[PDB]
Design an enzyme around this catalytic site. Structure first.
Site, short mmCIF file in Angstrom:
data_model
loop_
_atom_site.label_atom_id
_atom_site.label_comp_id
_atom_site.label_asym_id
_atom_site.label_seq_id
_atom_site.Cartn_x
_atom_site.Cartn_y
_atom_site.Cartn_z
N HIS B 39 0.81 -1.21 0.00
CA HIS B 39 0.00 0.00 0.00
C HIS B 39 0.85 1.26 0.00
O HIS B 39 0.27 2.36 0.00
CB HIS B 39 -1.03 0.01 1.15
CG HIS B 39 -0.45 0.03 2.54
ND1 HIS B 39 0.42 1.00 2.98
CD2 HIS B 39 -0.67 -0.79 3.60
CE1 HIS B 39 0.73 0.77 4.25
NE2 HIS B 39 0.07 -0.30 4.65
N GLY B 141 3.01 5.52 9.98
CA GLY B 141 4.33 5.23 9.48
C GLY B 141 4.99 4.01 10.07
O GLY B 141 6.08 3.66 9.63
N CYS B 143 4.07 1.17 9.45
CA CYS B 143 3.93 0.17 8.39
C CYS B 143 5.27 -0.35 7.89
O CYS B 143 6.21 0.41 7.66
CB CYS B 143 3.14 0.77 7.23
SG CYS B 143 1.64 1.60 7.78
#
Ligand SMILES: CC(C)(C)c1ccc(N(C(=O)c2c[nH]cn2)[C@@H](C(=O)NC2CCCCC2)c2cccnc2)cc1
Ligand SMILES: CC(C)(C)c1ccc(N(C(=O)c2c[nH]cn2)[C@@H](C(=O)NC2CCCCC2)c2cccnc2)cc1
Lengths: 301, 301
Positions: B39, B141, B143
Site C-alpha cells: 500500500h 508510518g 507500516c
C-alpha cells in the site's frame, strides 16, 4: 500503548562471558576494557564476608577467562573500581558504540539486556524503584547484564546487575561500581526500604490513557500541589515537586488537561479504587513509565 | 517475571526506509530484496478501493526511494507478491542474518521491532490474537515493521505490519504477503471477529506464577478436559486440546502440578474472579505468554 524497550543491537555486540575459577557471568566490553561485577572472584568459601582487595591480590590476569562469542580475549590487566572489576584486554571491541556512563535517579527507567554466559537472552523495560532496587527478571548467572538508554546513536549505560535480594528484587551498580542503595556484594542480611509509588510516573500513565481514548476517571475538580501531596503521603506515593508538574507540561498541553486537574483525578482514584474498571488494560496504577517514555511512545522517537 | 522480547540487533540491520511518491514507510532488506507493504503505492485518491495490479503498472523502479540508514539503494526491479511489494536492489545487505519466513498460528507470540522512517524506535512482545489481529503499539508510518522469533542465530520472520483497524487493533501479513485474518489493504469497513482468550497461554502464566512462589489460587480439585472446556466456552476461552495438555508437560513436571489440576484451579477463578488479589503483579489473567515463553524465561534460553 505498552512497555517498550530500546533496540538492543548496539549493546549486544558488547556482551562477553567472564569466567574466574568456576564462576561464570557476563561482562561489558567497551574499547579495551571489560566491566563485570567484582564478585566474580568470590569462592563459596568467602561469600559470607569477602575481603575483596585481599581476594584480588591472589588473582593473576590469567585467572580471568573472558570470551567474546567464541573468541578468547587476552587479559593484560585487572583492577577494581568500587564493586566493578575492570579487565584490560588487548583487543578493542570493534563493535564499541558511542557511550557514556550515567548514574540515574529513583523513578527513572531503562532497558535491560538480560544475558547468560555472555549471550543475550531478552530485553525488557525497568524502572529504578525509589528504594534503589529494580523489579527485574534475572536468573542465576544474569550478573553483569546492563541497563541502558539510547538517545540516537549514544548508549547511556546506567545499571549493571549484581545480586538478587532474598525478597526477590534486584540490586546493582552504575558502571563506576557504586551500588544503587545501601546494598553490598555480600551474602548477608540486607533489606530494601519501604517501596513507594512514583507519582509523576503514574500521572504520565494517566495522560497516556487519556491520549489513547480511555478517559472515564477524568473528573470535575482541581486541587493544589500542597493538598494533593497530603493525600499522596497517605497511600505511600512520592511527593510531587513543582518540577514534576513542569516535566508533565508537554503531556498536559497535548490533552488540554492541566497538571493539577489530572492530580485531582488521581486523588479520587486513590480514595476509591478502580472498582472493577481497567485503565489501559490494567486494573492497578502503573508507575514505571516516565513522562518521556509516554511522550516517546506517543511521538515515535 | 515479565513480558520479555528477543534481542533485536539481527533485525535492526535489515530495516530501511521506502518512499513512493510522498508516502514513506519501512522496508525489510534481506540479501538483494526489500520487502515492504504494497500500500506504499496508494495515493489518497485511490485509498477507498485501490486496483493494485493497475497502480503498480504505472510505477517504474525509480519511483521507489529505498534508503538504508543514509545510503540510497538502487532499485533494479519491482514485483508484487500478494500484499507485499518486493523491491530488488543492487546491493545485498551485508548484515543479512540467517532467516526463514514463517506463518504463525493464533495464540503464538513474537517480538516487534517498531520502526519509523527505516529507524528502529522500540521492541516489545506481542501475541497473534485468535481473531488474527495483534494488540500492538504502532503509530502512523509504523507500516513495514516486522515481528520475529530468534532460535539461536536464526531469525524467523512471521509478521509485517500493514494497518490499524479503526477499533484500535492492528492487522498485517506474513512475509509472503498473505494477511492474517479476513483483512484487506483498503480503507473500508472491516471488523475483527469476537476475540477469545488463549487458554493454554493463561495456564502457562499460572504455572509461571507458581514457579515464582505465587500460589494462592491453587486448589483441591481436579477435572477433565471435557468438563473444564465446557466451563471454558462460557467465558469465551478457547477450547483446550489434548496437545495443549502435552505442550504443558514440562511446566507441569517442574511444579508437580498436573495439567488438569491447574485447569481445576483456573475453572474456579473464572467463576469467582480474583477478588482484589493479584497474580504476578496483575489483577487480570494474562494470555500472551506461551508455554515456551514461560519455560524460556524460567530457563534463560
Ligand atoms: C557472592 C555474592 C555477592 C553473595 C553473590 C552470590 C550469588 C549471586 N547470584 C548469581 O546468580 C551468580 C552468578 N554468578 C555469580 N553469582 C544470584 C544471587 O544474587 N543470589 C543471592 C540470593 C540470596 C542472597 C545471597 C545471594 C542471583 C539470582 C537471581 C538473579 N540475579 C543474581 C550474585 C552475588
Ligand atoms: C492505504 C491503506 C491500506 C488504507 C492504509 C492507510 C493508512 C495506514 N496507516 C499509516 O500510518 C501509513 C503510513 N504510511 C502509509 N500508511 C495507518 C492506518 O492503518 N490507518 C487506518 C485507520 C482507519 C482505517 C483506514 C486506515 C496506521 C495508524 C497507526 C498504526 N499503523 C498504521 C496503513 C494502510
Amino acid at each position: 500503548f505498552r512497555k517498550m524497550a530500546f533496540p538492543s543491537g548496539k549493546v549486544e555486540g558488547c556482551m562477553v562471558q567472564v569466567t574466574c575459577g568456576t564462576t561464570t557471568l557476563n561482562g561489558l566490553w567497551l574499547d579495551d576494557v571489560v566491566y563485570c561485577p567484582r564478585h566474580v572472584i568470590c569462592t563459596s568459601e568467602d561469600i559470607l564476608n569477602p575481603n575483596y582487595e585481599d581476594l584480588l591480590i591472589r588473582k593473576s590476569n590469567h585467572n580471568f577467562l573472558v570470551q567474546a562469542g567464541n573468541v578468547q580475549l587476552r587479559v593484560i590487566g585487572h583492577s577494581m573500581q568500587n564493586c566493578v572489576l575492570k579487565l584490560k584486554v588487548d583487543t578493542a571491541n570493534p563493535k564499541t558504540p558511542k557511550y557514556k556512563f550515567v548514574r540515574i535517579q529513583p523513578g527513572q527507567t531503562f532497558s535491560v539486556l538480560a544475558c547468560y554466559n555472555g549471550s543475550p537472552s531478552g530485553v525488557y523495560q525497568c524502572a529504578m524503584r525509589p528504594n534503589f532496587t529494580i523489579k527485574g527478571s534475572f536468573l542465576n548467572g544474569s550478573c553483569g547484564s546492563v541497563g541502558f538508554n539510547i538517545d540516537y546513536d549514544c548508549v547511556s549505560f546506567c545499571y549493571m546487575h549484581h545480586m538478587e535480594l532474598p525478597t526477590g528484587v534486584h540490586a546493582g551498580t552504575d558502571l563506576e561500581g557504586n551500588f544503587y542503595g545501601p546494598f553490598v556484594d555480600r551474602q548477608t542480611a540486607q533489606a530494601a526500604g519501604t517501596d513507594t509509588t512514583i507519582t509523576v510516573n503514574v500521572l504520565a500513565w494517566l495522560y497516556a490513557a487519556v491520549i489513547n481514548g480511555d478517559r472515564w476517571f477524568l473528573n470535575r475538580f482541581t486541587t493544589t500541589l500542597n493538598d494533593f501531596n497530603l493525600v499522596a503521603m497517605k497511600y505511600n506515593y512520592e511527593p510531587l515537586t513543582q518540577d514534576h508538574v513542569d516535566i508533565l507540561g508537554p503531556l498536559s498541553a497535548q490533552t488540554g488537561i492541566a497538571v493539577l486537574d489530572m492530580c485531582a483525578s488521581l486523588k479520587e482514584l486513590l480514595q476509591n479504587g478502580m472498582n472493577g474498571r481497567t485503565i489501559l488494560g490494567s486494573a492497578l496504577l502503573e508507575d514505571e513509565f516516565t513522562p518521556f517514555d509516554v511522550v516517546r511512545q506517543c511521538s515515535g522517537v
